[PDB]
Design a protein around this ligand. Structure first.
Ligand SMILES: CNC(=O)c1cccc(C)c1Nc1nc(N2CCN(c3ccccc3Cl)CC2)nc(N2CSC[C@H]2C(=O)NC)n1
Ligand code: NI
Length: 193
């Protein structure tokens, strides 16, 4: 299986582990993990975070042929589990978390979108447009020990976590771009830039 292969001590996650558009797994709803976690489920989260750190290291990214990322969801590794990793550097980190069974439990009426649009590791093309998301979210998740965390996010952090949670729900960023008018600005939409 993908999880068995990826969680080998010797394995570093790279672009060859990341599935692309068209793979049914990206459109499937991922399964909740149960507690206690298996060693493999813990290792997977750790490997995913290591991938993000490698992708953000210019030297390592070059050596490994990585595209830079600030989030990764297990379904992108062909693993249909509700596990995501997020690593947003402060422009060392604005947000660093491995989240098991993450869930948005509250959100703002206000919407937000990145002014520069969104990119995705499983998408090898540019898809222009404002990706409309909630401006602010409250997120519950469990850590590797099964301890519950409840955090509040705004700005970039909020965008990134919503993007990754979408993956575990079979949703892609362009699903949230206005079809007819990709750069439309509705009342109540904050453009982040
Ligand atoms: C089409 N417009 C654009 O690509 C886009 C264009 C400009 C600005 C933004 C902000 C854009 N948007 C966007 N840029 C990113 N990267 C900026 C570069 N950075 C990065 C790159 C290299 C090394 C280290 C790092 Cl840190 C990695 C992250 N990432 C995402 N997504 C959206 S949510 C999850 C996140 C993700 O990780 N995607 C793979 N969106
Ligand atoms: Ni993505």
């Amino acid at each position: 299986s993908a999880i068995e292969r990826i969680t080998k001590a010797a394995h570093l996650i790279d672009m060859n582990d990341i599935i692309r558009e068209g793979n049914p797994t990206l459109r499937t709803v991922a399964e909740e993990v149960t507690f206690p976690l298996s060693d493999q489920e813990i290792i997977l989260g750790e490997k995913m975070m290591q991938f993000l750190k490698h992708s953000q290291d210019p030297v390592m990214a070059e050596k490994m042929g990585l595209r830079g990322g600030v989030g990764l969801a297990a379904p992108q590794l062909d693993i249909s589990k509700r596990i995501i990793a997020v690593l947003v550097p402060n422009i060392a980190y604005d947000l660093e978390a491995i989240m098991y069974n993450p869930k948005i439990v509250s959100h703002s009426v206000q919407d937000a979108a990145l002014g520069e649009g969104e990119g995705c590791l499983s998408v090898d093309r540019n898809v222009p447009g404002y990706v409309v998301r909630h401006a602010r979210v409250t997120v519950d998740y469990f850590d590797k020990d099964g301890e519950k965390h409840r955090i509040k996010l705004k700005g970039y952090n909020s965008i990134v976590v919503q993007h990754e949670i979408d993956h575990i729900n079979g949703i892609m960023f362009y699903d949230r771009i206005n079809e007819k008018d990709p750069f439309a600005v509705k009342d109540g939409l904050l453009i982040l830039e």
